[model samples]
Target: STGSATTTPIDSLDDAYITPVQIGTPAQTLNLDFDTGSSDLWVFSSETTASEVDGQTIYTPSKSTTAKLLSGATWSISYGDGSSSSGDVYTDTVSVGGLTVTGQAVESAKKVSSSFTEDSTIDGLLGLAFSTLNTVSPTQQKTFFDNAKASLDSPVFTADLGYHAPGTYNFGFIDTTAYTGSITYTAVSTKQGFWEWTSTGYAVGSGTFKSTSIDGIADTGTTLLYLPATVVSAYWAQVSGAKSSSSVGGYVFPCSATLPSFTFGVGSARIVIPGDYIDFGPISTGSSSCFGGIQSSAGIGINIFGDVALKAAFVVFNGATTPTLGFASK
Candidate 1:
């Protein structure tokens, strides 16, 4: 059977989409961030230190009869944003929507970084990236999608991240009614264990579209769109008060400034992100200033097409073969 679930936005488009997932026997429910950037299913658990656990929900594995420890196996993961978590492993039943995967390796976090500890809403992360990216040591683990693909009628999932709204994640099938126009397919190179691809080029406002190729990953976990330094600088130049701010971080501009639309090339398709979405809301209440949703990739190595960019288009993450990405207007 197929699986589908609603994705709740945390705060504006500055964070990520949270999806509910059930784990262990009798199913301990948790609101998890379905991340396409990394592969590791980890949760804030009873094993976590009480001092580190804030307001976040914790998974009580002991309450589940089917939760089995994986002996000495353990996991440790660090994100680009500096968020990290590590802990022992347990094999349990993990379900998303109507689909269920038995014996799924669930990482029980005993330690979490401040970045994760500060965010109380998200109890854990359900990684949707390729199984090759799974972080469980001694033996790598398969993601929920990977484990359930063989039994699925169609081994495909769609990411419909909405702008300041809740969307849906469809597993084992694609809903044609969710998108308009033809879906443009791009061959993905998963060398880095990510849904990595290249954009033909990009342009700011009504500027000429260049043919420069940019390699990047489509990361649902990332909040903002990260491009090369040159491209980011070019886009910010169009704004009068836009400047690099050490305090605000990234590029900041006057809230009242009229920003232009930004477009990126996918194969022959041009996906345009509206200017309003680029403003990323106000930096502070009465500052009359705002932080840009688009920033420089800088030390991140590759560009990241995060929630800001993904929400502008309907995305299809196909795992059938070479792992392709299909894009269409929402």
Candidate 2:
């Protein structure tokens, strides 16, 4: 009854950002990301230098009796997108939505570097991405979800979001009222900890590439589709009336045109990508020509169909019951 009326958990994949939870009371409130990718929860502390902790909401252990620290270990996280942060371990009474998990594992990061750090309108990220991306492992005592699940009336968490606009994001429980269908389940590939998988084929618009084969898995963590330069060029060739490359990251095409949609085969299933993704603007430093569905990277392991690919499906990460990602008709 006390939840925010405007934002609910996102059921779609288009959302660029996730909602943050405010912990402690009004005087000591700390906004943080409730991430499933990592186990430890953290916030900035008084010991942190103000300059080093710019644009971040710091927490005060003195505000709550439940707060404490874990000794003998240091934590640092590095993401594929050229970002890193290091901090100390601390514990406290954490609250999300209307739920509270006392004595939760938290990290107080003194330093973090990622492109995401900028324009972060939300106070922090609530990482509900997946366990493979989880910072905490089975070897650890307890994960944030393990300790916090008890605080919810129902165990389901739902995220409903839209990029480039206001969207609804929710947690704690899943509402069946949003859609009408059974969730389709898929087993996680036994590959590296990252979300990697083999695709069927790469396509742009109506033209399908015969030589291009399935290479990588789709990721929810990333906001853009990281495609190969060659494959991207092949796809762009089909767009006869598309505009020229406008930026270093990608292209600037006619956004309103009904461009051809693309798809990649994932095992037996054909994952479809909408044409709106093709209508990308331009990235700054405008040098490398990027397509909406592809980016040219010199050296990277594989291609990734990020959130843009997910926008078409209803995704669920059932890590509590089984390590699986289920897709449903959106």
Candidate 3:
């Protein structure tokens, strides 16, 4: 199996990779973080304004004779990290992982700074996430996956993230070697894009369910799972038998006893929430405790399944064929 993450540059700042993936005879380069967490394929461009080109990989359209511009329109995008950039829309002849898909949609931000340009080791991000999130809309609209799906050898998109610090996300192919046994699949919800799912019920240690049905969104972009106030309070009460803490504002149970395991009834799937995340010990200065997955996001349409929940299953967000999803054992 492939292991550990590393990045290599391709021809100045045109493309790059987290894994040393070689493509084509000359090998076209690309970055790996092109994902759906937010839409937009922002890449380095030589044509961008100096300020905008700072700290980012700026690609020169002149390098590739096949590259072309789309409807003359300006494009810009900003992230939650308070980072932003702007550029013009263009169509490029870019290749990644030995597959060549022409008329591929690409965007070159107009303005970038030195920090954005220098901090990047990879040449550019080759986003194949979702077309719906493309930064250049209306005038120039399309996503990398929309154009390249036909060229890929397999119908699957695999991501080998072992290279990065274990937390970096990888996509594209599934590793059969990672499967120790049979994988169990859960039905996908009808919702599109994000994994919208329903839980038949949630119970701690085989205890009675405080509520019957719960609907939730499974998001890989987030780190922790959050539930509605009603669910959080109820779920914790059942798990915390005799522990007490006020500062952290969640359950704090005794560590020695056999902790209760919370289970989310998803159709036929019974996902077990380990006691550790449910009863986070005294970590805060306030002396209050924290539960692993549940936070009292009362008014917030709450049941959000972050990475905490996804670690339990190999989730497939099938937006291509079915407005459906499938959960299999990792």
Candidate 4:
């Protein structure tokens, strides 16, 4: 059977998207960051240090009869955003949308970084990336999707991430009416464990489309669109008062700066990210400078089409032996 879940942005800046997931036998629900860029389903729990717990929801395995410790198993993970957590493992019933995995490995956090505690909105993270990236030691665990794929009508999931609005994540099938045009499929390389693929080219505003192959990952966990320096420069150059700032950090511009729509090609389909999404927001509450949503991936090693880019398109992560990624306009 198939299922669908609602994903809502955690803040006005669209820093991250979160969805509710039900875990344990009695079905305890927790809002989790459904990340596709990493593969470790970890949560703040009874085992977490109280100081590190802050105001977040804690998962209590002792209270769930279905929770069983995976003996001699443990997990530790660090995200690109610098937040980290480590924990022991438990196999329990976990459900997302309306789909259920009777025995899904759930990592119970014993420790977490300050960043996690500081952001009280996120209770944990549910990884949707390939299980090969799973950090569980001795015996790696499959992600929720991997465990649920066999029972699903179709072995795939779709992400319709939105900008400052609630989006939907569908499992097993794509909602035909959710998108406007025919879906453009592209081969995905799981060599990196993430949904890695290459884009055909990009165009700034209404400028001529530059035909080039741009390698990147469709990372829902990431906050912004990170591209090669040249591409970022081309787009930033068009802005009237844009510049790289030392204090504000990243590319910032006058709050009223005119932003051109950024477009990237997926096969023959060109997905346009409207200018409004690029005006990330004012750097400070009373500041007149706004930060840009697009940045250079020079330090990141690989380009990342984060939420800023993914928000503008409906993305499908096909879980076939020869996996593929599909993009469509809505």
* lDDT against the true structure, each candidate: 0.91, 0.52, 0.51, 0.93
**How displaced is residue 310 in candidate 3, in Å?**
2.5
Q: Give stretches of model 4 more than 4 Å off.
A: none
Ranking by TM-score: 4, 1, 2, 3
lDDT by residue (1-330, candidate 4, tens digit) is 898999999999899988999989788888999999998898889999888988888889998999999999999999887889998999999989989998799999999999999999999999989999999999999999999888899999999998889999999998999999799999899999999999999999999999999999989999999999999999999999899887766899899888999999998889999998988888889889999999989888999999999999999999987899999998
Q: Residue 223, candidate 4: how far off, in angstroms?
A: 1.1
lDDT of 3 by residue, 1-330 (tens): 111224332222112124332222233354544333444565666776665444444466666666677776666666433556667866666555434556766677667544456655543444444555556756646655556555444334433222112322223444566534444444445333344667677776777654467777655433355766666666656653543345644445544434566667666656666655344444554544433445654445446665445545555544455434445444
TM-score of each: 0.97, 0.72, 0.61, 0.98
lDDT of 1: 0.91
Work out how many backbone clashes candidate 3 has.
43
Residue 300 lDDT, candidate 4, scale 0-100: 82
- Using lDDT, rank the candidates from best to worst: 4, 1, 2, 3
Scored by lDDT, model 4 comes in at: 0.93
Minimal lDDT window, size 10, model 4:
241-250
Model 1: per-residue Cα lDDT at residue 128? 89
Q: Write the per-residue lDDT of candidate 1 for residues 225-274, one digit (tens) a residue.
A: 99999999999999998999988878999988999999999999999999
Candidate 2 Cα outliers beyond 4 Å, as residue runs: 1-15, 25-47, 114-117, 120-122, 129-143, 149-158, 166-174, 180-182, 194-203, 206-218, 228-231, 240-259, 264-271, 278-280, 285-293, 296-298
